[PDB]
From Swiss-Prot, chain C:
Origin organism lineage: Eukaryota, Metazoa, Chordata, Craniata, Vertebrata
Recorded family membership: Belongs to the eukaryotic ribosomal protein eS6 family.
Protein's cellular compartments: Cytoplasm; Nucleus, Nucleolus
Record's comment on post-translational modification: Ribosomal protein S6 is the major substrate of protein kinases in eukaryote ribosomes. The phosphorylation is stimulated by growth factors, tumor promoting agents, and mitogens. It is dephosphorylated at growth arrest.
Function: Component of the 40S small ribosomal subunit. Plays an important role in controlling cell growth and proliferation through the selective translation of particular classes of mRNA. Part of the small subunit (SSU) processome, first precursor of the small eukaryotic ribosomal subunit.
Complex and partners: Component of the small ribosomal subunit. Part of the small subunit (SSU) processome, composed of more than 70 proteins and the RNA chaperone small nucleolar RNA (snoRNA) U3.
Modification type (3R)-3-hydroxyarginine: residues: R18
Source organism: Homo sapiens (Human)
Disulphide bond pairs: none
Name by which UniProt lists this protein: Small ribosomal subunit protein eS6
Modified residues (Phosphoserine): S29
From Swiss-Prot, chain D:
Subcellular location: Nucleus, Nucleolus; Cytoplasm
Chief subcellular location: nucleus
Role summary: Component of the large ribosomal subunit. The ribosome is a large ribonucleoprotein complex responsible for the synthesis of proteins in the cell.
Residues in cross-link Glycyl lysine isopeptide (Lys-Gly) (interchain with G-Cter in SUMO2): K63, K83, K90, K96
Species lineage: Eukaryota, Metazoa, Chordata, Craniata, Vertebrata
Annotated keywords: Acetylation, Cytoplasm, Isopeptide bond, Methylation, Nucleus, Phosphoprotein, Ribonucleoprotein, Ribosomal protein, Ubl conjugation
Family listed: Belongs to the universal ribosomal protein uL3 family.
Superkingdom of the organism of origin: Eukaryota
Protein name as catalogued: Large ribosomal subunit protein uL3
Residue list for modification Phosphoserine: S1
Gene: RPL3
Post-translation changes: It is not required for incorporation of RPL3 into ribosomes.
The organism of origin for this protein: Homo sapiens
Residues of the full protein shown: 304 to 403 of 403
From Swiss-Prot, chain E:
GO MF annotation: an example: large ribosomal subunit rRNA binding
Keywords: Cytoplasm, Phosphoprotein, Ribonucleoprotein, Ribosomal protein
PTM annotation (Phosphoserine): residues: S8
NCBIfam families, A to Z: PRK08571.1
Subunit description: Component of the large ribosomal subunit.
Official protein name in the record: Large ribosomal subunit protein uL14
Subcellular location, record wording: Cytoplasm
Role noted for this protein: Component of the large ribosomal subunit. The ribosome is a large ribonucleoprotein complex responsible for the synthesis of proteins in the cell.
GO cellular component: cytoplasm; cytosol; cytosolic large ribosomal subunit; cytosolic ribosome; extracellular exosome; focal adhesion; membrane; nucleolus
Biological process annotations from GO: cellular response to actinomycin D; cytoplasmic translation; G1 to G0 transition; negative regulation of transcription by RNA polymerase II; negative regulation of ubiquitin protein ligase activity; negative regulation of ubiquitin-dependent protein catabolic process; positive regulation of cell population proliferation; positive regulation of gene expression
Assigned protein family: Belongs to the universal ribosomal protein uL14 family.
UniProtKB/Swiss-Prot annotation, chain F:
Shown residues within the full chain: 3 to 174 of 858
Gene: EEF2
Keywords for the protein's UniProt record, in alphabetical order: Acetylation, ADP-ribosylation, Cytoplasm, Disease variant, Elongation factor, GTP-binding, Hydrolase, Isopeptide bond, Methylation, Neurodegeneration, Nucleotide-binding, Nucleus, Phosphoprotein, Protein biosynthesis, Spinocerebellar ataxia, Ubl conjugation
Protein residues bound to GTP: A24, H25, V26, D27, H28, G29, K30, S31, N156, K157, M158, D159
Name of this protein: Elongation factor 2
Coiled coil: none
Role, per record: Catalyzes the GTP-dependent ribosomal translocation step during translation elongation. During this step, the ribosome changes from the pre-translocational (PRE) to the post-translocational (POST) state as the newly formed A-site-bound peptidyl-tRNA and P-site-bound deacylated tRNA move to the P and E sites, respectively. Catalyzes the coordinated movement of the two tRNA molecules, the mRNA and conformational changes in the ribosome.
N6-succinyllysine, modified sites: K150
Originating species: Homo sapiens
Lineage: Eukaryota, Metazoa, Chordata, Craniata, Vertebrata
Post-translational modification as stated in the protein's UniProt record: Phosphorylation by CSK promotes SUMOylation, proteolytic cleavage, and nuclear translocation if the C-terminal fragment. Diphthamide is 2-[3-carboxyamido-3-(trimethyl-ammonio)propyl]histidine.
Length: 116, 60, 59, 100, 131, 172
RNA sequence: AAUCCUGCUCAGUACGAGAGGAACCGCAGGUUCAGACAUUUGGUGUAUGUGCUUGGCUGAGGAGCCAAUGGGGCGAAGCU
RNA sequence: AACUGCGAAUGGCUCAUUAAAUCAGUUAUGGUUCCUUUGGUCGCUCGCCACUUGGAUAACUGUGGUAAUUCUAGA
C-alpha cells in the first residue's frame, strides 16, 4: 500500500511489480513489465497500440450550464424599497411622468421669464 | 485543506478548513466546472450542491 | 443554512450607470422620472458631515 | 485482508496457486523462501534458540498482500478489480444475450 | 545513522562511465573500487554510491594521466531499492571527488540516485535532481 | 540592537568603557562563553544558537573547531541603580560598553595573546574546574600580569564536575 | 562452518601542553563462504504460444507448408 | 486608481561583424508601402429601439494561496 503508480500504457502498477527507468534529462517513467518497457524503448507510440489505455480512450472504446437571475440590494438603498419601487403601480408611474411633463412646462415658464 | 465557499446570492464567502480526505473524496478526482454535492461535508451541508470554480496548488 | 454565508446579503457595490440598465432594472417604460430614479449613495464618516451623491447616468 | 486493505480476498492468487491448487484451510506465512517444491510437506518446529535480537522480537503488521496471478505477469488483484477495469467483453456479451 | 543496503553492482574494473561534473573530464575509466576485499578471479565491481579510483581517458590534458577518486552517481544496471522498486538509469555516470568527499566540480548534469546522494551530502547538494 | 547614533553617544564616554579579553587554555570554553555573552549583551548582537558566532570568522576555524584568528566584539547593556552602587569607580550612567577581544589559547599563538592584551585593560580568565590550572592558563596569566592587566576569574564546565566527576559539594 | 570489515553512539570523551585521539555495552549494515528459493527483477525459450516478414510451393482468397530452428518481436510453465 | 488612444521602432552607447558588402556621388521605383501633418471625400448606393440597442469588463467591496516576483485565483 505505497503510492499507486501508473505505467505509460495506463495500467496500474502495484508495489513490487514492474520496473522504473530514470532518464538523463531528469524524467522518470514506470513500466508494468518488459513488454511495456521494450515498447517504450523502441519508441512506439502508445496511441497505435490496441491494448493500451491511451488507445482505448482515443478510439472511444468503452464509451448543463447554469443561468441565474438573482435580484439583490444595491448599496446606499433598501432591499424592500427597491422591489416596491420597481413594482410601482402604473397609475403612479403615469402620474409621475405627467407631473414631469408639467414640471418641464413650468421650467419653460421660468426660462422665458429669466430670458425677459 | 482550506476550501473557500462562495454563494452568489448572498456573498460573504468564507473559508472552511477540512482535515478528512474520506469526506473530501466527493471533490477528489473530479474536474472544475462540474457540479457535485457537498452533502458529505456534514448534515449541515446536506442538500447543498456546489460547482468547482478554481483552486491553488501547494506552491500557490 | 450555514451561518455567515447564507444570510446577511451584501448589497451590490454600485448601481447601474447606463440608461437602459437602470430602465430595465426598474421596469420604466418611457421617461418616468429617470433623472432622480438613480440610487443616491450616502457616504457617512464620523469626523465630518455625512452626505449623499448620485452617479453619472450615461447613454 | 489486512488492517488497511479491507478487501474481500483470500490468500490465493488470481487463478489459483500454480502447481498447488486452492488453499482453503489455515496457513502460515513465512518471511523468505523455504526448501522444497510446491506441495512438499514441511515440518515447522519451534526454535531451539532463545530469541532476543531485535529482528526476532519485532512485531509484524501487514499493510497489503499481493494476490495477482502468478501464472504469468498478472496485473489485477481481484476478479472485481479486473472486471471493473476491462468492462464488458465478448464472452460476457453473448452469454448475456442468450440467457436474457 | 543507517548504512546503505546492497545493490546490484554492474560496473566492474574497466568500466568507462560518463563524467557528469564540469571538471572538463568526459569519462572515467574505473580501475578499482574502495572497500573491496575481493576473491580469486573476481573483478571488483561498483554500484551507485560507491567510491572508485578512475582515470579520465577523454578530457582536459591536465587530468588525463592521473588517478582520481570518483563516485558513481548513476548506473545502468537495474537494482532493487529495498521496497521492490527496480530502478535503472539511461547511462552510467560519475563525478570526481577527493578523499574527504567534497566534489571537485561544481555542478552535476542529470539525476543522482538516492543512495549516492544520501551517502555523500556534498554530491547531493550539487545534484540537479534526485531519482 | 540599536543604531550607530547611540553607539557614538556612549562611545564618547570614557568612564564606562571596559576593554577586556578572555584568556584560557586550549578547549576551556572560551568560544562558548563569548557566544553566550554575544547572545546576552551586544551593541547589535542577537542570541543566535548556530554553534560558534562571528568569533570564529574563518571557514577553516569552523571546519576544525579551533579558534585561530582573534575576533573583536562589542557589548552594550544596562544595569539597575542598585547594581550601580557597587561600582565605586568613575560611574557615568547605566549604560556600559565592553570591547571584548577573543584570544586563541594555543601556545603558538602567544603573540596573538600579546596583541589582544596590549589593547585590553582587563582579562576574564576561564579555568576549567575539571582540569584545574593548566599550562596555557599559567602562561597567559604570566603574560597579562607582566603587562599590568587586572584578571578576574570564572571557573567553567561546572556541570562536568557535578555529573561526569560526581563530586560531592564539600570536595567541589 | 561460519568469517571479517565499516558507519553511528560512547565522544572531539578518557589520555595528552598541544596536535591529535581511543575502548567495553548497544544500534545499522556490508565482505568472503555455506545452504536454499523463484513472489519480485533479469536470462533462456522449439509451449515451434502468438503476431510480423523474405524466397519459394499449394490455380487465387482463406488456411498452410519448406529453407537441417528461415529470420525477427513479444512470451506462459520450468530451470536459473 | 483603472479601461481606452498614443508613445515605448526616437534618442543614448559601442565599433564586434562586414572588402562592390557597408558607404559617397548619381539615378529609378511607368517595380512598392507609409501611423502621423496638410488639402481633397464623409445624406452621391433607394435599405415594435433611433428621443440611441446588447453582453460584459475594469478600477472597486469582500475571501485568499505562495518563502518569494510589478504572480494572480474565487464571488
Ligand atoms: Mg456622455
Ligand atoms: Mg510466475
Ligand atoms: Mg586468475
Ligand atoms: Mg513468403
Ligand atoms: Mg494469404
Ligand atoms: Mg518439398
Ligand atoms: Mg537443403
Ligand atoms: Mg526474449
Ligand atoms: Mg500606430
Amino acid at each position: 500500500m505505497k503510492v499507486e503508480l501508473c505505467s505509460f500504457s495506463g495500467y496500474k502498477i502495484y508495489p513490487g511489480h514492474g520496473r522504473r527507468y530514470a532518464r538523463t534529462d531528469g524524467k522518470v517513467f514506470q513500466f508494468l513489465n518488459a513488454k511495456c518497457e521494450s515498447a517504450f524503448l523502441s519508441k512506439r507510440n502508445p496511441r497505435q497500440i490496441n491494448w493500451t489505455v491511451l488507445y482505448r480512450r482515443k478510439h472511444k472504446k468503452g464509451q448543463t450550464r447554469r443561468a441565474v437571475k438573482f435580484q439583490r440590494a444595491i448599496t446606499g438603498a433598501s432591499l424592500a424599497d427597491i422591489m416596491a419601487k420597481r413594482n410601482q403601480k402604473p397609475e403612479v408611474r403615469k402620474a409621475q411622468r405627467e407631473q414631469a411633463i408639467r414640471a418641464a412646462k413650468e421650467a419653460k415658464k421660468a426660462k422665458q421669464a429669466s430670458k425677459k | 485543506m482550506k476550501l473557500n465557499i462562495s454563494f452568489p446570492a448572498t456573498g460573504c464567502q468564507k473559508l472552511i478548513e477540512v482535515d478528512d480526505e474520506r469526506k473530501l473524496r466527493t471533490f477528489y478526482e473530479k474536474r472544475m466546472a462540474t457540479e457535485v454535492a457537498a452533502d458529505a461535508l456534514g448534515e449541515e451541508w446536506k442538500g447543498y450542491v456546489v460547482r468547482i470554480s478554481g483552486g491553488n496548488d501547494k506552491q500557490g | 443554512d450555514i451561518p455567515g454565508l447564507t444570510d446577511t446579503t451584501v448589497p451590490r457595490r454600485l448601481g447601474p450607470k447606463r440608461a437602459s440598465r437602470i430602465r430595465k432594472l426598474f421596469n420604466l417604460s418611457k421617461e418616468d422620472d429617470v433623472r432622480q430614479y438613480v440610487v443616491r449613495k450616502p457616504l457617512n464618516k464620523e469626523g465630518k458631515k455625512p452626505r449623499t451623491k448620485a452617479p453619472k447616468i450615461q447613454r | 485482508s489486512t488492517d488497511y486493505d479491507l478487501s474481500d480476498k483470500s490468500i490465493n492468487p488470481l487463478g489459483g496457486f500454480v502447481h498447488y491448487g486452492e488453499v482453503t484451510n489455515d496457513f502460515v506465512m513465512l518471511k523468505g523462501c523455504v526448501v522444497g517444491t510446491k506441495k512438499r510437506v514441511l515440518t515447522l518446529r519451534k526454535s531451539l534458540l532463545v530469541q532476543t535480537k531485535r529482528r526476532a522480537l519485532e512485531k509484524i503488521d501487514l499493510k497489503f498482500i499481493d494476490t495477482t496471478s502468478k501464472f504469468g505477469h498478472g496485473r489485477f488483484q481481484t476478479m472485481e478489480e479486473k472486471k471493473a477495469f476491462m468492462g464488458p467483453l465478448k464472452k460476457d456479451r453473448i452469454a448475456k444475450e442468450e440467457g436474457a | 545513522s543507517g548504512a546503505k543496503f546492497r545493490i546490484s553492482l554492474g560496473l566492474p574494473v574497466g568500466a568507462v562511465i560518463n563524467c557528469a561534473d564540469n571538471t572538463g573530464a568526459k569519462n572515467l575509466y574505473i580501475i578499482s573500487v574502495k572497500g573491496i576485499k575481493g576473491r580469486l578471479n573476481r573483478l571488483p565491481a561498483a554500484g551507485v554510491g560507491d567510491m572508485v579510483m578512475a582515470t579520465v581517458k577523454k578530457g582536459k590534458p591536465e587530468l588525463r594521466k592521473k588517478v582520481h577518486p570518483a563516485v558513481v552517481i548513476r548506473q545502468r544496471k537495474s537494482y532493487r531499492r529495498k521496497d521492490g522498486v527496480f530502478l535503472y538509469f539511461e547511462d552510467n555516470a560519475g563525478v570526481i571527488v577527493n578523499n574527504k568527499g567534497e566534489m571537485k566540480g561544481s555542478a552535476i548534469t542529470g539525476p543522482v540516485a538516492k543512495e549516492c546522494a544520501d551517502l555523500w551530502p556534498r554530491i547531493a547538494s550539487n545534484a540537479g535532481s534526485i531519482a | 540592537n540599536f543604531t550607530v547614533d547611540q553607539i557614538r553617544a556612549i562611545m564618547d564616554k570614557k568612564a564606562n568603557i571596559r576593554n577586556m579579553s578572555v584568556i584560557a587554555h586550549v578547549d576551556h570554553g572560551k568560544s562558548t562563553l563569548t557566544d553566550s555573552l554575544v547572545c546576552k549583551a551586544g551593541i547589535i548582537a542577537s542570541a543566535r544558537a548556530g554553534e560558534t558566532r562571528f568569533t570564529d570568522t574563518r571557514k577553516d576555524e569552523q571546519e576544525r573547531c579551533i579558534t585561530i584568528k582573534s575576533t573583536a566584539i562589542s557589548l552594550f547593556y544596562e544595569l539597575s541603580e542598585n547594581d550601580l552602587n557597587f561600582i565605586k569607580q568613575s560611574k557615568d550612567g547605566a549604560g556600559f560598553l565592553i570591547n571584548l577581544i577573543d584570544s586563541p589559547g594555543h601556545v603558538d599563538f602567544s603573540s596573538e595573546v600579546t596583541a589582544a592584551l596590549r589593547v585590553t585593560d582587563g582579562a576574564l580568565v576561564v579555568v576549567d574546574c575539571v582540569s584545574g590550572v593548566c599550562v596555557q592558563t599559567e602562561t597567559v596569566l604570566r603574560q597579562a600580569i607582566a603587562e599590568r592587566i587586572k584578571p578576574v576569574l570564572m571557573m567553567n564546565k561546572m556541570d562536568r564536575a557535578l555529573l561526569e566527576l560526581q563530586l560531592e559539594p564539600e570536595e567541589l
